[PDB]
């Protein structure tokens, strides 16, 4: 798009409220138990134990030479306070006499705002991982997945076009594309790593680029994406781990922009 | 409310000092022992083991005293100096703490998962329901996320708009099933940080030189409806781990507020 | 005090160098062994195992509209941080006893205040029933009692930091409802084996002027310094006993003459 | 080179996209098992267990000397957008990792000592020799710090100027015996962070909103000699710990570059 | 210093740069101490010369000027060979019950540098007043030759000038904040048993050495005084489970300019 003047005047700005609920393998914020393939056997995790990118397309007011331009977003991880819970069946500290473990371990927090689906690059820890249908993993055109999927091979790309479909563990945001999307992510590893999350209604993220242009919403659609895996729940007795996801709130400010 | 000019002149600004004491299940800064339901049994924690949001409504000086005035005035919260009081209380290795280095060392200082949170507003803080276990049984008089029919389904573990409340009572709304609602609270400013982990060390700073500005993108602060300033607090520093019993108790700290307000005109 | 113009000209500014040595229960940077009361028995720690606020009043040049010294800025440093790079002085030994001694570790607090009067203290303690030996001073009501409310905020429990080595860190914090004429700065870190992180440079400066460009005004021509620098605990091999370790704080205050009504 | 005016006008700026895949001893993001010499035996690690600097020379558009102009033109690297690709790949607790909570929990995510480093330059990055063990035996075709006589003495464990190299070959210079030479690299900008520890969690961020400025104290960027832009990378995220074997493997990640260059005149 | 400072001479040959490196002095000269030893409770604390890390220090000769003094304006400094620590094969204590790789350098660490126009002023403070430092090391002594309990806190009687490389132990001397008017110093210490070192390296950082009044260190006797203390942590050896201090070299690049002075 050749970008022109910013239309100002009445009915020239609008806000969009939306939330994305987490897709950690089931719909209620927890995966099924995390399983580990035995050395030499297939790496074939259960559908319901594999966290995926949350994604939605919000319909914007119809315009027509004008496109909605995303200027800023207020975003928050909802239900952080839910984790201050040491009674709900957690593995017990101090030889079983203390309280249950709060959510801990490896976690990722990520959001994107765009005028089109987020561009994904294929990269995974184990090229041989078997993702059950209907999940989508990095495949060559011939249907195979070789060792190169553990590093950067441009052959492995996708568009984040379906909720609860693209596993976090084999797709990252493609930095060679996403010209019309703004994305932000932080991953922390470790076995018992404590989650650190902040929440305030005073933060704002500017979405304008080096040249003061925001994401331009093609087909009058605003594209939100989320991945908020706070860590794992560790259950007493079973000592099994479950991925715990949290919902993300969005508040996008858009304005009318003219295009050639 | 259509916001107008900021009235300046004498008696046009005022300060409010307040403190909120913590409500961690009892009134003296400690919960009763944290209990854990056995797998397959009801998750039914004791009233006195469940930390709640502290909350108060401070009465502000009367405004629309002048029966001739052409414009209504509301107090506008501009800035707050806030401090977590008694942080230094935690430098204590003699008061019955689980003992380090095979029992020959000093007692454990407060450690583990902690949350620190405050809000200033012109009305009660808007809460969204979200909890780790939808089936948790909160004893009366605590209030948890319920649908209109009285039930609580699996959706309460993620975002379902059906689960909302106003933080209208002290020591009543559990921290673990209510968070600030980011879809509302237009007339409140809230700030929170949570840290998880089993033995995580609390890190807290204290100074009388910090100030938090409460004005929004458009230079408007919280406007105090009914001449009431609404303070909220949640300062669970971590857990006390007791020697011998090896039981854990939530430890809360009080929060000090110093709000600067000014008169603002409204249509 | 109604504050007026800042007197400028010769002999209108001065600097004060001072150090506060730590008061961790003895005078040489270590407490006696930390003891823990048995559940159900009195919580009665030894005088020499309880760290206290360090405090001094520096005498300023006599001045006498009246003039008061105004504290503008302070360069401050925690002295002897490098002293902790020591793995040979009797520390509990790592890697099954074959490695070096534990460096100072565990819960620590670092705090300083500059003021024109004694620092205002608020009473708050972990255990209301703690018995502080004389001559230490703990939160008492006027009647001499100490109730459960001392574990949260009760305004009845206040004091002025008017004596060195007297006010325990564990039952007194800076009172944020007062200290209009003091500037205080403090950071506490908990944990059992938490590593201390301390920096030192002669390039840092802390401005002491308030929202209205007024610094602490030194009443009775006295500058009031306060310190609490408990770097952590020393863990001794064999005994596996813990001792509080304190460090001294250096102050360099710049003051200027200010007029008052 | 005497640096002159910045040529502006049409065809005077250009961008370069590139990626460097990691060289951790094999080409698919993992080393072979990390081995440890027995005390008193040779320190002789396998070729395929030794991570190396990734490196490439990107060809820039040829800049043709104008016999009427008084001044030659060189490409000047102004800014770089760079990202560590496939960070999200590490949120994997099913792919054969050593299992937590006595073997009943999920596999360990990548953890332990890690280094993240990138350089942009108008020539090969200048390397200084420094290694933990001077006696380490690097198999051919790797290149380690050698004196002219072929030996490597104790001084290679500190700074000896005799041990220098140019990062002129991919997958060749081990990270563990070469660092960026701060006494040179006038025409390169380099950025690195190392974290030690046994089980240290990696912390990595990713966004398409970050930019690193490459201009120096005097507003001059790397000047690309022979119309070549020199990229270097070292992104060892940590180790994979395998269940049962309890063997460790270095895990590398690819780095994306997006360099903005402009024409600069030189005497 | 006690020099009255005047105008900054500008013009040709009025600025110069100095490149230098200080190699670490952790008790031997090749980046490692001998094994760390621990006195038994009740016995003398008498560590080996070669197990005690010391401040690195050098005096660089500047071009002769004559009044004019060289003024240190800025320094680019870097800890060299950080990447050397990404080594899990060189005899380190082995992780995951001995089946994993060797421990990288870990534990308590200090990183420190100073630039000055004279030797760095040191204050005596030590963890154990009774520590016995072998000759030729220099520890805090009173004039009478003794060292009392006061050396564990601040006693002004215990001072020294960092006038010799590999001589002043880090563990009993810190920079004296009551002096060093003509030096700029910067240090960070981290404790703990297994604490991971975190070090960054870039040729884009610069540290300004000018004070509150835009005056840098003035190099007395046409000498620039560099000091370093970079103990990255300890090496933990498999089988022996003994610990060795590991030091790293520091690179300096100082920019100086001519400054005029009275008297
Ligand atoms: C990643 C993976 O391959 N998971 C597999 C698990 C793991 O072996 C468990 O960890 C056993 O504890 O076992 C299965 O039999 C199962 O539970 O259905 C098959 C499944 O494909
Ligand atoms: C969270 C919860 O449900 N707590 C329950 C506990 C836990 O199961 C104990 O930790 C093990 O008995 O048990 C009770 O008998 C109790 O102690 O009062 C009932 C209570 O409902
Ligand atoms: C660094 C080093 O010298 N490693 C040597 C190792 C290790 O001692 C063991 O693998 C212990 O893990 O032993 C070898 O037989 C091997 O595996 O190839 C030879 C190799 O040269
Ligand atoms: C700091 C110190 O005083 N170290 C002493 C050590 C340690 O006690 C042992 O290495 C640990 O048992 O013992 C010595 O015999 C030695 O190693 O030469 C004398 C030495 O003076
Ligand atoms: Cl939605
Ligand atoms: Cl009050
Ligand atoms: Cl208790
Ligand atoms: Cl906060
Ligand atoms: Cl501080
Ligand atoms: Cl593998
Ligand atoms: Mg009336």
Numbering used by the authors:
A (entry chain B): 24 to 87, 95 to 290
B (entry chain C), D (entry chain A): 24 to 290
C (entry chain D): 24 to 87, 94 to 290
E (entry chain E): 22 to 87, 95 to 291
Sentences from the paper on this structure:
Polyomaviruses are small double-stranded DNA (dsDNA) viruses with a circular genome of approximately 5,000 bp. All glycan-binding polyomaviruses analyzed to date engage oligosaccharide (glycan) structures featuring terminal sialic acids that in mammals are usually presented either on gangliosides, which are molecules composed of a glycosphingolipid, i.e., a ceramide and an oligosaccharide, or on glycoproteins, which contain mostly complex and branched oligosaccharides attached to amino acids during co- and posttranslational modification steps. These sialylated glycan structures interact with loop regions at the outer margin of the major capsid protein VP1, at the apical surface of the polyomavirus capsid, as revealed by X-ray crystallography and cryoelectron microscopy. The VP1 surface exhibits an astonishing plasticity, providing virus-specific interactions for a range of Neu5Ac linkage types and further specific characteristics of Neu5Ac-containing glycans.
In order to define the ligand binding properties of the three animal viruses ShPyV, GhPyV, and FiPyV, we conducted crystal soaking experiments with sialylated glycans, which yielded additional electron density for the glycan ligand so that we could solve and refine complex structures for ShPyV VP1 with 6′SLN and 3′SLN, GhPyV VP1 with 2-O-Me-Neu5Ac, and FiPyV VP1 with 2-O-Me-Neu5Ac to 1.6 Å, 1.65 Å, 1.95 Å, and 2.8 Å resolution, respectively. FiPyV VP1, which was also derivatized with 2-O-Me-Neu5Ac, forms interactions with Neu5Ac that are very similar to those observed in GhPyV and ShPyV VP1. The methyl group of the N-acetyl moiety reaches into a shallow groove formed by residues T58, V59, A60, D66, A67, P68, E72, and H117ccw. The N-acetyl amide is recognized by the hydroxyl group of T58. The R122ccw side chain interacts with the Neu5Ac glycerol moiety, contacting the hydroxyl groups of C-8 or C-9, depending on the VP1 chain. Residue H69 of the FiPyV VP1 contacts both the Neu5Ac carboxylate group and the E72 side chain, thereby providing for an additional hydrogen bond between the protein and the putative Neu5Ac-containing receptor. However, FiPyV did not hemagglutinate chicken or human erythrocytes, suggesting an alternative receptor specificity compared to that of the related viruses, likely influenced by residues surrounding the conserved BC2 loop Neu5Ac-binding site.
